[PDB]
Design an enzyme around this catalytic site. Sequence first.
Site, PDB file in Angstrom:
ATOM      1  N   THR A   2       0.008   1.301  -8.933  1.00  0.00           N
ATOM      2  CA  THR A   2      -1.011   1.798  -9.850  1.00  0.00           C
ATOM      3  C   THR A   2      -0.397   2.716 -10.897  1.00  0.00           C
ATOM      4  O   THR A   2      -0.678   2.585 -12.094  1.00  0.00           O
ATOM      5  CB  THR A   2      -2.104   2.528  -9.072  1.00  0.00           C
TER       6      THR A   2
ATOM      7  N   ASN B   8      -3.045   1.293   5.768  1.00  0.00           N
ATOM      8  CA  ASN B   8      -3.474   2.371   4.883  1.00  0.00           C
ATOM      9  C   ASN B   8      -4.856   2.844   5.294  1.00  0.00           C
ATOM     10  O   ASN B   8      -5.782   2.036   5.407  1.00  0.00           O
ATOM     11  CB  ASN B   8      -3.482   1.912   3.424  1.00  0.00           C
TER      12      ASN B   8
ATOM     13  N   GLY C  86      -0.984  -8.780  -0.321  1.00  0.00           N
ATOM     14  CA  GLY C  86       0.051  -9.720   0.015  1.00  0.00           C
ATOM     15  C   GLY C  86       0.121 -10.020   1.497  1.00  0.00           C
ATOM     16  O   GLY C  86      -0.828  -9.789   2.257  1.00  0.00           O
TER      17      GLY C  86
ATOM     18  N   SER D 217      -7.140   1.873   2.021  1.00  0.00           N
ATOM     19  CA  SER D 217      -6.537   0.581   1.747  1.00  0.00           C
ATOM     20  C   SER D 217      -6.864   0.116   0.333  1.00  0.00           C
ATOM     21  O   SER D 217      -7.367   0.866  -0.506  1.00  0.00           O
ATOM     22  CB  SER D 217      -7.000  -0.451   2.772  1.00  0.00           C
ATOM     23  N   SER D 218      -6.548  -1.142   0.057  1.00  0.00           N
ATOM     24  CA  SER D 218      -6.939  -1.732  -1.206  1.00  0.00           C
ATOM     25  C   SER D 218      -8.392  -2.174  -1.141  1.00  0.00           C
ATOM     26  O   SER D 218      -9.050  -2.106  -0.101  1.00  0.00           O
ATOM     27  CB  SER D 218      -6.041  -2.917  -1.553  1.00  0.00           C
TER      28      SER D 218
ATOM     29  N   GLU E 150       1.060  -9.638   5.342  1.00  0.00           N
ATOM     30  CA  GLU E 150       0.999  -8.443   6.164  1.00  0.00           C
ATOM     31  C   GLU E 150       0.971  -8.852   7.623  1.00  0.00           C
ATOM     32  O   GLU E 150       0.723 -10.012   7.952  1.00  0.00           O
ATOM     33  CB  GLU E 150      -0.228  -7.593   5.827  1.00  0.00           C
TER      34      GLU E 150
ATOM     35  N   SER F 146       0.834  -1.195   0.000  1.00  0.00           N
ATOM     36  CA  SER F 146       0.000   0.000   0.000  1.00  0.00           C
ATOM     37  C   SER F 146       0.871   1.249   0.000  1.00  0.00           C
ATOM     38  O   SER F 146       1.568   1.528   0.980  1.00  0.00           O
ATOM     39  CB  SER F 146      -0.937   0.001   1.210  1.00  0.00           C
ATOM     40  N   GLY F 147       0.843   1.999  -1.095  1.00  0.00           N
ATOM     41  CA  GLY F 147       1.715   3.138  -1.250  1.00  0.00           C
ATOM     42  C   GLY F 147       3.029   2.845  -1.933  1.00  0.00           C
ATOM     43  O   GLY F 147       3.973   3.627  -1.781  1.00  0.00           O
TER      44      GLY F 147
END
Lengths: 680, 375, 375, 375
Positions: free
Chosen positions: A144, A184, A410, A187-188, A412, A139-140
């Site tokens: 993207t 995050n 993934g 988040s996703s 975490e 995340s980050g």
Amino acid sequence: GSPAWVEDVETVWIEATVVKLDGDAITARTVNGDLVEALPRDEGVDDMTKLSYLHEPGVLHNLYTRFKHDEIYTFTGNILIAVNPFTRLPHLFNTYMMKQYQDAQPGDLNPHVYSVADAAYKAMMEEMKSQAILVSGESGAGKTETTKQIMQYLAFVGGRSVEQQVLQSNPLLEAFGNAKTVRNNNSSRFGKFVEIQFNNGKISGAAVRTYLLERSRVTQISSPERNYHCFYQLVAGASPEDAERLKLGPPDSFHYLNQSKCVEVGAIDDCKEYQLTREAMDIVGITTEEQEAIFRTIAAVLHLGNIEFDSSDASEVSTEKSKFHLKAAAEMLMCDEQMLEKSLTTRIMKATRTESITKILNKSQATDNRDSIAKTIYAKLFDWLVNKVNKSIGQDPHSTVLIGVLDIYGFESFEINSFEQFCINLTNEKLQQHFNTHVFKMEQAEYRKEEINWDFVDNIDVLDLIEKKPLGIIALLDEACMLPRSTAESFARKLGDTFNNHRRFSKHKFKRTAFTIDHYAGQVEYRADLFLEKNKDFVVPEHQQLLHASRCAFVSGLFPADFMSIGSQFKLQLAALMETLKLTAPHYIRCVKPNMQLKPQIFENKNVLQQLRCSGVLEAVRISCAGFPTRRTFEEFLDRFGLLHEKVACQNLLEGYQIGKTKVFLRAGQMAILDTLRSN
Amino acid sequence: DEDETTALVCDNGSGLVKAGFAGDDAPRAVFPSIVGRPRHQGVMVGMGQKDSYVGDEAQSKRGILTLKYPIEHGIITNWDDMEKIWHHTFYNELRVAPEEHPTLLTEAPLNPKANREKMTQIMFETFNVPAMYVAIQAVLSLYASGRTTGIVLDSGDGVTHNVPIYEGYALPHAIMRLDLAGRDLTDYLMKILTERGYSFVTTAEREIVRDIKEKLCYVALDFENEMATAASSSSLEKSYELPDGQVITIGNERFRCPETLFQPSFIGMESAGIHETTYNSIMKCDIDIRKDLYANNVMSGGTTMYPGIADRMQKEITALAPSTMKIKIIAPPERKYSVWIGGSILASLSTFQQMWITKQEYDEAGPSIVHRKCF
Amino acid sequence: DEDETTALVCDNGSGLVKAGFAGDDAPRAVFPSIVGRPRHQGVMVGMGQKDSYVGDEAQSKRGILTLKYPIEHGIITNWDDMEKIWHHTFYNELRVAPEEHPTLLTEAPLNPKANREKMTQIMFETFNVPAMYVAIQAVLSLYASGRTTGIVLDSGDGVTHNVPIYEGYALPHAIMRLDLAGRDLTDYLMKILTERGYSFVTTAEREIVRDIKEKLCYVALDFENEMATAASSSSLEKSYELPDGQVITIGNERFRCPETLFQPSFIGMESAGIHETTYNSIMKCDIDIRKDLYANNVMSGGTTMYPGIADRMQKEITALAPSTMKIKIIAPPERKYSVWIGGSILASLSTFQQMWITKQEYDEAGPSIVHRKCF
Amino acid sequence: DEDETTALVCDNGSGLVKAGFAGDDAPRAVFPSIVGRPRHQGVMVGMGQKDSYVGDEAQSKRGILTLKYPIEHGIITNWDDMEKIWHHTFYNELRVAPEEHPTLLTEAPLNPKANREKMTQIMFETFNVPAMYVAIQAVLSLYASGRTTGIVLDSGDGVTHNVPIYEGYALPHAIMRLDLAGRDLTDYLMKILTERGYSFVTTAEREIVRDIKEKLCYVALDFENEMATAASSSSLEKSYELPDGQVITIGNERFRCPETLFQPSFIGMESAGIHETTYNSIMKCDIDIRKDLYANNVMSGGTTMYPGIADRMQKEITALAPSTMKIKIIAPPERKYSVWIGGSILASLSTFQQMWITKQEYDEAGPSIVHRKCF
Ligand SMILES: Nc1ncnc2c1ncn2[C@@H]1O[C@H](COP(=O)(O)OP(=O)(O)O)[C@@H](O)[C@H]1O
Ligand SMILES: Nc1ncnc2c1ncn2[C@@H]1O[C@H](COP(=O)(O)OP(=O)(O)O)[C@@H](O)[C@H]1O
Ligand SMILES: Nc1ncnc2c1ncn2[C@@H]1O[C@H](COP(=O)(O)OP(=O)(O)O)[C@@H](O)[C@H]1O
Ligand SMILES: [Mg+2]
Ligand SMILES: [Mg+2]
Ligand SMILES: [Mg+2]
């Protein structure tokens, strides 16, 4: 003896080259100064495949150097690795840089990923149609924007706006999907897939295979990731008159949305985001009646979350005190109130040949039935949006060659590894198993290419002990889920008492209930909270009939076509996704990120080590060093022998080296021993 | 574990094992010490059914379990049991890794030496405790009540001992020990309720009988007009409910069940009874220090909680002892938790720091060093 | 056959044989277990006329067939019959080659050992099943209702048994077994309808009488004011149609036909009746665990579906048992399919995988191993 | 009546009531104690059909009678029954006006006091006996066998008790009492014969089962090689004839039915078994007098007549007790009539003359005087 690395607190491997000290009492100076009395030898670089020592010290040194050299240094390794610089990429995503990537094959492929994208596009042009590239990154990590730059490089390559439509579609997807996770605040959403179908190079078709949604987020939540962004946006009140038309209360009013006190978030303007989502739905082509029906469906889900269930033998029936949330849910779904109440408290589907029995279920069963109806409804809602997404996307005219792209959550960590996090860890485990299989296939191809007779499975053992056996941990969880009065601690006692020995996994410490398991990204002790309450699920036929035949037309279209273990269906879906990914040619890409300062010229070696551990970059380095890591040509070995003290003369001066066709497939430890012999 | 490396204090005492950290004023872990075994065939799958039940789970399932009291009369019978109960008290209640804190265990006086040698051996060699120490259940009652010096008349479910302690010194030539304890009052009550018509034979009933003894028993002032008067009218007869829902009436056996502690001919032992034990214990001390003990004789232990023990003991001493002599019985009302409260102080609140058995000395000496040190 | 190698679950139970795959929630094959023989001379050629009718074809042609119930009172009488009915259930209903899936069969408690030895022998040696297992019809009712632990009061057409199950263990010293079952209510009804004037003697009428018993019978709350009041007015009298088109009126015999399950002196057996059977079954357990069973005693079996069984049983326990005691009878409404639903779980949804009888062990051991394994 | 005013001696003992005059060496009246009721409707006139059958007429008509054992486990259940059986034994067998001779009745130890208070009350107030006395079934066995002093290990159909008697004194602190008696062996045999295939449920069968237990049962020396070897061959299998003319074969259940007296886990009671009961009874006596009891422990009571009881008991003591210790079991072969023979002496052949309860003292004292006198 003096040139080495040094393990310390901050500098986890400081390349300290001062004094040849004793074997374990290693007292010398360092970069920080004089130290006290065992890290390995030490010798920005584009590839460390020819390094004298293949260690985390040299890897972290090259990482911090390329961070200092401002280079996104991608080692070749049959897999590249870049870093999110948190800055602008001038002459790196440029069209002349894209023209150079289309032109320069060997040179520009070192740090640049658009050159690797052009290589993948040429491989797809080399009749390797089924092909995709793995994108490692958290995340980050900028994955993207990396995928956007790769799509731009592919549009420069393949020719033939799908990218702008994909940009407009991610706001609709993430609002329905993303929440405020521990990693995050935005988040996703879930696992997302993309497939560009090429019409003989003319990339024209759009396809998606986004699966493995977070179904458990419907009712069970315990952290700031409770409110879905669509759920918070509907809680934001995107229309004031339609709020009274939907009887929508406060954000604190929904008990299903009352999980862990994260009602107000300093991350989103969900009213303006809801207006932007309505604009994006109009851009996708959603009708205003369709948008009103989607909002009414979410409102009915919220009222059903607000629909309390209660407890003659009162332990098989319910009551109604705040029946307003029940009646509003019946109204917003456009179905009969008594019929929905009977579909709640009855569960009456027990038929033999012409007889029929009504098994009036218990209150603890009743709440699970409500949760199952909700988890069915929201999944159907996500599926209908996916259907409209694929409709507005548009595929090709029966093309046969497509290129894939995948982005899944993934491995975490958290304060506690939940069963949702456990399923995510199992997903990352299967993904790492596939990535390690691809790396082992590439290693065997490199060994057979140089004709090297070079003579892991414990990951398959972890997958077996978790799920795959008939007596597996997922299997035992499903088994104890069925037989009633199964205590959670009693589940834990059998969990640690079956497969007790013989794993990278055992029981917890002097605590209540947890199961410690050493996955490939390290050891995590998942705390045995209500996973036995989380994994429960049910699908009854009469609820499907009430969903199909209700008076709401869009809701009837959301379930028109009308085994019980979330782990079971998750295993089936993950196996299906892995089998679909198995048919393509693999590539891998790692997106690092300077997440310490979220700015350039910064480095977090703890976060970088966690990235290399979670994406298996350190594990891929370990698997690469497991084979023949050193590989130098006969002229290169002759130059190294001249630096130390022509293949037969080097063999006489030397006497795990294995001279292949022209290279000498050796061990990197043998290379370090030869470097120590050259230095001494 | 713990937020401090203070030592750990637990009495095992054959009854209700008391455990907790030093420096506290309240024991953090209490359970009836008992080891359970399933005796009947299982058919239903998946409800644990583990064959080692112990403690507070054990009184829950106590209908289909055998009972095994592990420690009898101050002696430890089976060492697998105490190996079990130590492990259960450490890892489940106070969740403490035992190699972080020293421990303090206890005994009655005059227990056989192999027992203390086994107990000293086991915590060191199986749990790797840093340090160990054994105290005396006669001693710490005074540190509980504050230093009044006298006869410690303590009787738990294990034993009864009579130790005089004067002025900082103990008198080993004249301690006493009897075996009329909690269990023998249970077993006299078992033969006594059978006179009324009720019937209890199996060991699951034992903890039920223990409850009625814990509730409806009181020590009569006279033992003749009580046993004549309650035989003349039902003013003493009360009722109790067995866990089925039955109602059982109790006759004069509210008082006759602890009456035998002052008349131990009934259960066929031959001894003096505890009051004459106290008096004969005092008469074997010097004529110089006597009159303190008459005014500072201190009760302890949960068998001395029957409502009437104080006045009865006082009247019996006063008739027995020489006349013009002030006699005074302390009866502090935390007495059922007295001993552990004593272990509260002595571990933490002293110079008790080189007096521990450093495990180094155990590795150099063997077990028998716990003979020559701690008393 | 099947799309999965899951095992096969069928109760034979002497009445309506229930059969289906494991992991389902609905039995896929149900028929009245009966073996038919033609008794009259045939003259018309070519309509099959095969001399082995069985099951749902058998109730179709049941006017010119003898009837042979194969299993009586929990005992199997003729082994050609069960050899027939197993083959018919396998090959015609679930069309399954039997050597692909293991099987789960059942029994009542206390059935003679030669019966289970024959049943274990036959599926292995005639059908070559991979694995076999025998369960108890007392057990699986709890896995049907969810694990409430108590008395399983189940009575089918075979037998009536009373098994207490506590907490994961069963109590073999105090199970019960009576023979007042579905058949004896039929045979009391046969002698009872003959009082009104109707007359039934032959065995083809037996399944007709079974129908009227299945419909128009209900258990009266009191057994005196009911039998006085329905003798005072015809408010209870209803009507029924025999398959000829006749109309038969029923008097007070709507309730007197299952009245005798609480008064089994009428049919001349000597026993307690099922409620006192339940009470005497409970009193032979310990005083520790009793009060769960009073609140978790669970009915089962299709003879307990008469509308009034629950309140009658409750009033009878409440008058019988000690007073201040909460009594609570579960009566789940899928009870006529309870047992097979129990076999739904236990085959598929457990660690029940090495607990099967591998046929290898049968070839090494013989039949009697099914004694020492499954209970 | 009698040719002498000697007293009358009868044991009731819940089984076969034994009765006769004192001073004889043979009991003149023996019958199985049982009360019979007609359960079926009579139609034939004039064959008596009186609704109170008792005793030796009762085993004659025992097909159409209910059975009511009046005395259970040493406790008397219904007082109309014992009022009946006393009257039948007096007026029909020994035809004696009961107000001419005193009587001697008996009990087990530890029977409830209301029972003895009722029994003392009834003969005085309903029969007007001159004098009464209650003995102990532990005692008189020694006067039967001649004064050897030891453990009296007597077990009838009521109870089992273990009383040590030394040298003229008894030891009330360490007697024992178990309930594994004749009836529980019958009821284990009822569940045991059902394993073979036979079936007995009603109470008229109970006295038939009692017969087979009385004949074909013997106590095996080892309990493993016997139960393996008789499972290996039919050398132990014998036959018996039920009164219809059937032939019933018996398997290894000739020995397993009294095997459980040395392994009372089978019937689900929890206790020691009778040999460990004897050993734990001895260990609660002093170390001074022990070695007499090992050589003078005396059996009694008709449940100890199975052919093999002596060697089995001896081997079990010898393995259990300390080694170099001569152990010796008397087993006198009139033991089934031992107790009454004891009552032969003690009534007539002593100074037992002021020790009777003169009925004057009963009129002055009430019933409870039989507490304070006879033991
Ligand atoms: N009414 C009562 N209140 C408290 N304790 C009682 C009572 N009646 C009896 N006891 C006995 O007190 C004992 C308390 O434990 P105890 O044996 O005193 O511990 P310790 O052995 O450490 O002295 C129990 O064994 C119980 O038998
Ligand atoms: N009204 C009724 N509804 C259902 N079953 C009934 C009814 N009346 C009687 N029965 C009896 O219920 C029985 C159902 O089969 P059952 O014997 O319960 O199977 P199992 O032997 O497996 O328990 C039938 O024998 C039938 O005699
Ligand atoms: N083979 C046998 N011979 C004699 N008595 C036997 C035999 N088998 C069993 N018994 C039992 O012995 C008992 C004799 O009566 P018993 O109970 O001894 O009288 P009491 O109660 O006075 O001791 C009967 O109950 C009977 O059950
Ligand atoms: Mg204690
Ligand atoms: Mg059936
Ligand atoms: Mg008798």
